[PDB]
Amino acid sequence: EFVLTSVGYAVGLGNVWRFPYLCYRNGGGAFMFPYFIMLIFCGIPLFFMELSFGQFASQGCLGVWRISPMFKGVGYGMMVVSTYIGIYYNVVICIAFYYFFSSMTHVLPWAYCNNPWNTHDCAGVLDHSLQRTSPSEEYWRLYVLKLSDDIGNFGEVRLPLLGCLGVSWLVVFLCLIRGYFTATFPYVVLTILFVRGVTLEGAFDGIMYYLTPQWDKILEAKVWGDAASQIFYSLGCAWGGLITMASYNKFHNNCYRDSVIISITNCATSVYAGFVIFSILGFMANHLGVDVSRVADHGPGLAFVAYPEALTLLPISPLWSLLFFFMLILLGLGTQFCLLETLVTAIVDEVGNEWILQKKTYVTLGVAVAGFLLGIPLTSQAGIYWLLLMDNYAASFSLVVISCIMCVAIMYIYGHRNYFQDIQMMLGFPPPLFFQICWRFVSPAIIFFILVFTVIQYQPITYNHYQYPGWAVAIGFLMALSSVLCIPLYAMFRLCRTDGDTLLQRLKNATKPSRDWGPALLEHRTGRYA
């Protein structure tokens, strides 16, 4: 609450790197209305539910499911999703390392078109064919990446990217064993890049495209599904680490205010970063003689094309570039540290024995080595196709499905009356009537309708937006299904060893709360728990 809401909880790579390119891909102004609609009704209530559920019983992601032991497969589905994110999230950081190390010059290498790697259609604003190209993304596409023409063309492994990835993983690991620039500063740099960028010629045309709604695309379930993914990704829902660090709070803590403040601050930061990004696109379209809708590419590297071009127009550009990329590195490292600490704690707690928890260093070393080896294919000539595949399939809508299943399990299996009496124990008042309504009828129905209309409107041979081959779509579907299949598969395991009779009483004996469910203190087990 105005202390940690700005040093973190709102600022990260999910606000300055993912939201701009998702918004640009999905239309720009046609993405804003579903974004706000699904923020108000479909993820402010769920953030509060997750925080209260974590804080009530002081348990992590696994072990909080004593409310209904049969549904423990929801906890394992968040570790599978977090494992996918933890692999490719540290490849975005190693790209920031590459730009940070390449800014230690007297002229920025992406400022002119006289470099040996530039084509004949380069066009800059400092110092023929069709569709003239800015110098900023030729550096990203022909020098940094050396992109190939297909996902099946592996090519050669890029040595500088591999070195930066190794450095990033070593830095992350060295802090797990032993252990300004947060709040204010991430906003000062953004304000500097925003004041310089609304004065340019053509910036207004990129702002109107960013805000003007398009009413012909509100009947598509794809846009609504993509808007739901970003809300849950940035807020941290269904990651698993939100419950773990909510369990350290005091019993009589006001998590309602914290949830509201954090949600609003995160939304404001995302929108402000979008304002910063979309002003540059208008200027690029103006001086390149193209339209704003087609000036750039709908890939995950929009932030590495627009941001370095803005820094080139500022006085003493290298000094600003160094600070910007150092800030990006720190922002990524904080989230990576949080995620890996949560994952290691969850792993050690489940396996816990006498040998384990005394060798926690070796588990941390094994996790870091395993995660470094899986990122090697993402540093080759076809590494951006794999990064886009794991960002659109592995963790896009599985988070929404898992959160919806958790909400349905808490309200309709445990009971809404019991949970409403539980919240009143922590706070002094019952939950607001708006939150009670947007917990039993609104959010589940909205998510259900989006999911149902996604598969009915499917099979157009068009929702495959990047023209991936046949096997890539199958691999993506396997990645997306490996996290939501942990929910029915664990239930089958639990139901095959629960003492009982034919499957009418075994269902009832497995969904009952455990004997040790409730507040985790003797002085707070008052009422229905004494």
Ligand X SMILES: C[C@@H](Oc1ccc(S(C)(=O)=O)cc1C(=O)N1C[C@@H]2C[C@]2(c2cc(C(F)(F)F)on2)C1)C(F)(F)F
Ligand Y SMILES: CC(C)CCC[C@@H](C)[C@H]1CC[C@H]2[C@@H]3CC=C4C[C@@H](O)CC[C@]4(C)[C@H]3CC[C@]12C
Q: Is 236 in the site for Na ion (CB under 5 A)?
A: yes
Examine residue 270 and tell whether it contacts Cl ion (CB under 5 A): yes
483 contributes a contact to Cl ion by CB under 5 A? no
Stretch binding ligand Y (CB under 6 A), from 16-24, 208-216, 390-398, 425-433? 390-398
Query: Measured from the CB of residue 85, what is the shortest distance to Cl ion in angstroms?
Result: 15
- In whole angstroms, the minimum distance from the beta carbon of 293 to ligand Y comes to 21
How far is the C-alpha of 302 from the C-alpha of 132, rounded, in Å? 17
Options 92, 447, 472, 486; binder of ligand Y; rule CB under 6 A: 447
Q: Three-class SS string for 294-346?
A: HCCCCCCCCHHHHHHHHHHCCCCHHHHHHHHHHHHHHHHHHHHHHHHHHHHHH
Choose the binding region for Cl ion from 53-61, 162-170, 171-179, 224-232 (rule: CB under 5 A). Answer: 224-232
Residue selected from 123, 211, 357, 445 as contacting ligand Y according to rule CB under 6 A? 445
Nearer to Cl ion, 5 or 270 (CB): 270
Per partner kind, with CB cut-offs from 5 to 8 A, the member of ligand X, Cl ion, ligand Y, none near residue 55 is none
List Cβ neighbours of 384 (8 Å cut-off, separation of 6 or more): 145, 147, 299, 300, 301
Residue 234 binding Cl ion, by CB under 5 A: yes
Instruction: Please give the helix or strand (H or E) that residue 239 lies within, else none.
Output: none
| Under 8 Å between Cβ of 242 and 54 | yes
**Counts of helices then strands in the chain (DSSP H, E):** 24, 0
The entry of Cl ion, ligand Y, Na ion, none near residue 517 (CB within 5 to 8 angstroms by kind) is: none
Within 328-367, which residues bind ligand X (CB under 6 A)? 334-335, 338-339, 342
Which tokens belong to 155?
A: 């090519």
Q: Is 157 helix (H, G, I), strand (E, B) or coil?
A: strand
Check residue 335 for interaction with Cl ion (CB under 5 A).
Answer: no
- Number of Cβ within a 10 Å radius of residue 82: 23
In this chain, which stretch among 296-304, 325-333, 342-350, 440-448 interacts with ligand Y, using CB under 6 A? Answer: 440-448
| Nearest-angstrom CA–CA distance, 231 and 271 | 12
Among 396, 422, 423, 468, binds ligand Y (CB under 6 A): 396
Tell me the closest approach of the beta carbon of residue 238 to ligand X, in angstroms.
Answer: 9
- Which one, of 224, 217, 221, lies nearest residue 457 by Cα? 221
Task: Check binding of 26 to Cl ion (CB under 5 A).
Answer: no
Of 211, 192, 400, 408, the C-alpha closest to 313 is: 192
The tokens 């010059």 sit on which residue?
Answer: 105
CB of 407 to ligand Y, least distance (A): 8
Is residue 7 a contact residue for ligand X (CB under 6 A)? no
Cβ within 8 Å of residue 61, ≥6 positions away: 75, 78, 79, 240, 241, 243, 244, 342, 346
**Are residues 181 and 2 in contact, defined by beta-carbon separation less than 8 angstroms?**
no
Residues near ligand X, by CB under 6 A: 8-9, 12-15, 51, 233-234, 236, 239, 241-242, 245-246, 258, 262, 334-335, 338-339, 342
Residues near Na ion, by CB under 5 A: 8-9, 12, 236, 331, 334
Residues near ligand Y, by CB under 6 A: 159, 162-163, 166-167, 169-170, 173, 368-369, 372, 392-393, 396-398, 401, 404-405, 408, 440-441, 444-445, 447-448, 451, 454, 477, 480-481, 484, 487
Residues near Cl ion, by CB under 5 A: 19, 230, 234, 270
